[PDB]
Design a protein around this ligand. Sequence first.
Ligand SMILES: CC[C@@H](Oc1cccc(CN(CCCOc2ccc(OC)cc2)c2nc3ccccc3o2)c1)C(=O)O
Length: 268
Amino acid sequence: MTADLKSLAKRIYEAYLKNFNMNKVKARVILSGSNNPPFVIHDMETLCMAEKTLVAKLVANGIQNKEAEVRIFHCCQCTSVETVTELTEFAKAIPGFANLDLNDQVTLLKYGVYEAIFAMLSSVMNKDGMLVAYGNGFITREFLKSLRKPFCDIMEPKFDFAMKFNALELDDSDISLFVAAIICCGDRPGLLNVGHIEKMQEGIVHVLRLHLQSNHPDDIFLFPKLLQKMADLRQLVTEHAQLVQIIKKTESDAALHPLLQEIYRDMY
Ligand SMILES: CC[C@@H](Oc1cccc(CN(CCCOc2ccc(OC)cc2)c2nc3ccccc3o2)c1)C(=O)O
């Protein structure tokens, strides 16, 4: 009569497979190289071609269309909004999460979503670029670096994180538990029921530790490596939020979707 941690790990993995449109298996199939192959965006010509096919409404305004960098900024936010919806549904599978007060659920998701986004973003990145638009585009790392400041500073730190994160060779069963652990941080600002959240965190981290022990017997330090990656993600989000605020304040055409402005409001 004890918790079945192996069953819980499988439940979390199944909830991740059901709730996230993108995962590492799907991304790798596309990145390896028959139907709906990804359009390569490596310069302004190919960006504009891709937009006309994949986000036609955004470029149907003629001389009124926004600057390319601002269009990219908007597209990035759209993915974040959708991923927040997926993360919110995923969180229901985490033991104890749905039993928390609604306000604590909101706070955990507020601080956790971008850490989870950047962790999962790594699955669609290689050293040369990243998948976009539900796997239907591939935008090169060099093209994103070529954008005018400060838009060229958005993605590069996330590539830097991803190259090292991907070198750990996690699979989706690992990532699902890592995302659940990200969401269950008992030290987020403003939590009410810290005690219950700490116990929820302890439980999911126990599931993660045992899973990594079983799934990665070759890497005895993988668990502390991932604890450090969680801290790295918190710093990456803090810096990202600062950049988003600079853009919002100084780029009169770069707007922030209201759901994301609420996430960012009073975060760091
Ligand atoms: C800028 C403010 C914005 O920052 C960022 C910064 C980095 C990443 C994101 C979200 N993101 C990139 C989507 C790009 O989406 C397009 C689509 C079309 C296009 O042109 C045709 C160009 C880019 C993404 N997260 C994922 C999670 C898992 C799997 C894949 C994922 O991808 C937002 C924020 O803070 O929300």
